[PDB]
Amino acid sequence: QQLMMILNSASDQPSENLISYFNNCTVNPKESILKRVKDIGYIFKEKFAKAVGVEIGSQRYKLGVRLYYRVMESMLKSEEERLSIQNFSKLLNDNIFHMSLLACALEVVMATYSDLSFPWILNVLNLKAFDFYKVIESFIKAEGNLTREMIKHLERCKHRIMESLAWLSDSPLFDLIKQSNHTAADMYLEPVRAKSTSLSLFYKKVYRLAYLRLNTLCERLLSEHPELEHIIWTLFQHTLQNEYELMRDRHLDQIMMCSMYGICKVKNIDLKFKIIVTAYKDLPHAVQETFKRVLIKEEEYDSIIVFYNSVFMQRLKTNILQYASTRPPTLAPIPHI
């Protein structure tokens, strides 16, 4: 609420201190920013009215712009001490950065006055999910006045990217994988020419997420053999690392479910899919469609079992059978607290 009243009384264009920073740039970007704001405003108002039968669409967008500008300033204030004069100015003239900061401010506004739910704004601004991921944490950390529910929303936005949206085809994440600290500005200053801080942070966070979800379902379902959780994590984590094609257009929680059934299957452990798959519904934001509609190949979808036997097993039979031999694979590290 407080932030929402700083914005209503605030201004639709940059503070003077924010312009101080524009005056610290070699290529004064301010011209480019104002143009970006207006051209985006045009596309935003269209797609806005296009879905809800302007007046509201214009006012949503201006609050975002006030939030966009407030956070940029705060963000630039940390980045003074971190970036060279050259990197500072490259940031302020970087399209994908500014697109992502504004898209994140706008999502805040949209979801406060809340389907139009995320990722609508990323389809509005044609902004790749993986690009947007780079801004979220630094955004939360640059706006001390986000409410709890709202932080929860950005984090939910963040987690859906980690679990699916970054794994969509044509998503740049796959281009970054093939070639194989951590502020939003660091990740946007990455070039598009051939190690990626962006990929390293994403995979690191994904592993902590993916494991914590594994841990929950393993304690409920594998308390009879607490020995299986670390083995299942090994299959899961090996799969995310070296068989990353399996995640393409699929869901992190789908790979988690196959791994637990797979490991229990080669351990001759009686734990059927539906026994765990019913337990997955009891995860916080879980959906039934996650195990009811699973991609096989060329746009053909089916249950998770059809995915298990017809795609998952076909691709991992060589790895999975090592876990029951006299020379099982070495166990993968647990992601750090």
Author numbering: 383 to 435, 439 to 499, 511 to 576, 599 to 612, 643 to 785
Q: Any passages from the paper?
A:
The retinoblastoma tumor suppressor (Rb) is a multifunctional protein that primarily regulates the cell cycle but also has roles in cellular differentiation, DNA damage response, and apoptosis. Essential functions of Rb occur through its pocket domain, which is necessary for regulating binding interactions with E2F transcription factors and transcription repressors that bind via an LxCxE motif. The pocket domain is the most highly conserved region of the multidomain protein, as well as the most frequent site of mutations. Protein X-ray crystallography of four missense variants reveals how mutations destabilize the protein fold and inhibit E2FTD or LxCxE binding.
For E554K and E533K, we sought to understand the structural basis for large reductions in RbP-E2F1TD binding as well as substantial decreases in thermostability. The significance of E554 in Rb-E2FTD binding was initially pointed out by the authors of the two RbP-E2FTD structures as forming an H-bond the phenolic hydroxyl of conserved tyrosine in E2F1TD and E2F2TD. The structure of the cancer-associated variant, E554K, reveals how the lysine substitution disrupts the potential for these interactions by forming a shared salt bridge with E533 and E551. Remarkably, the crystal structure of E533K shows something similar in which the mutated lysine sidechain creates a salt bridge triad with E554 and E551 in a manner that occludes the Y411(E2F1TD)-binding pocket. Together, the variant structures of E533K and E554K reveal a structural basis for the disruption of E2FTD binding. However, from these structures alone, it is not clear how the mutations induce fold destabilization. In the structures of RbP-E2F2TD RbP-E2F1TD, both E554 and E533 form A/B subdomain-spanning salt bridges to K653. It is possible that the loss of the salt bridge interactions contributes to the large destabilization effects observed for these variants. Within the cyclin fold of subdomain A, the greatest destabilizing effects (ΔTm) are caused by E554K (−7.0 ± 0.5 °C), E533K (−6.4 ± 0.5 °C), E492Q (−5.4 ± 0.8 °C), A490V (−5.1 ± 0.6 °C), K462E (−5.0 ± 0.5 °C), E539D (−4.9 ± 0.5 °C), A490T (−4.7 ± 1.0 °C), and A488V (−4.1 ± 0.6 °C).
